[PDB]
């Protein structure tokens, strides 16, 4: 219902040649998208500490929280978009993006 | 807090009723396993992912990486995996501290 969250889950493996400073700047820019994208309300990210997925190799997670029933197209065309944008789409060796409403 | 995150793809044979059963049963583990804090799950709506990719996300909150492991080895979790592992084709597990 109203006020339900729409979440994106970004699942990343960075290319070997991406530097630690580059990764940090990427996450910093993503967190700040909240201030730029009206429908975007939260960004939290994390580094996996367990490494139990064998050969899949994903290491980082970004959780993006959006308001529901609001356009997010300004995010889709934003230069910083991890999949579509010119700025960061070269950073990842592997990338998955999911779009779901959390429920219980 | 820390997050135990599950990304899963069900086996092709699994029905909608069985996915509902899977998540109802899993969410109820919070009533049984002391270590668990909140559980949320959701279905991916991305058309790109649906044919062959992962389809469902489960988020579980824990106090620490230690209490994630308390959950992992709890009899009720061992039991859950024993009889519901058959439901998934593959999964990804991540344990991390969210930050901004």
Swiss-Prot record, chain B:
It comes from Cannabis sativa. It is an enzyme of class 4 (lyase). Keywords: Cytoplasm, Lyase, Magnesium, Metal-binding. Changing residue 58 to M: Slightly reduced activity. Changing residue 26 to F: Increased activity. Its main location: cytoplasm. Homodimer. This is Olivetolic acid cyclase. Involved in the biosynthesis of cannabinoids-related terpenophenolic natural products, which have pharmacological activity. Polyketide cyclase which functions in concert with OLS/TKS to form olivetolic acid. Has no intrinsic polyketide synthase activity and requires the presence of OLS to produce olivetolic acid. 3,5,7-trioxododecanoyl-CoA binds at residues 4, 71. Pathway: Secondary metabolite biosynthesis; terpenoid biosynthesis. Residues 2-96 form the Stress-response A/B barrel domain. It comes from the Eukaryota. The keyword Membrane does not apply. GO terms for molecular function: cyclase activity; lyase activity; metal ion binding. Changing residue 26 to L/M/W: Reduced activity. Changing residue 71 to F: Total loss of activity. Coiled coil: none annotated. Changing residue 4 to A: Total loss of activity. One of its GO terms (cellular component) is cytoplasm. Its EC number is 4.4.1.26. It is found in: Cytoplasm. Changing residue 74 to A: 99% loss of activity. Changing residue 77 to A/N/Q/S: Total loss of activity. The active site is at 71 (acid/base catalyst), 74 (acid/base catalyst).
């Amino acid at each position: 219902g109203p006020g339900m969250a729409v979440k994106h889950l970004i699942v990343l493996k960075f290319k070997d040649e991406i530097t630690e400073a580059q990764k940090e700047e990427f996450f910093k820019t993503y967190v700040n998208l909240v201030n730029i994208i009206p429908a975007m309300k939260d960004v939290y990210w994390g580094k996996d500490v367990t490494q139990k997925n064998k050969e899949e190799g994903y290491t980082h997670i970004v959780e993006v929280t959006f308001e529901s029933v609001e356009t997010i197209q300004d995010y889709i065309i934003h230069p910083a978009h991890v999949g579509f944008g010119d700025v960061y789409r070269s950073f990842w060796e592997k990338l998955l993006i999911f779009d779901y409403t959390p429920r219980k």
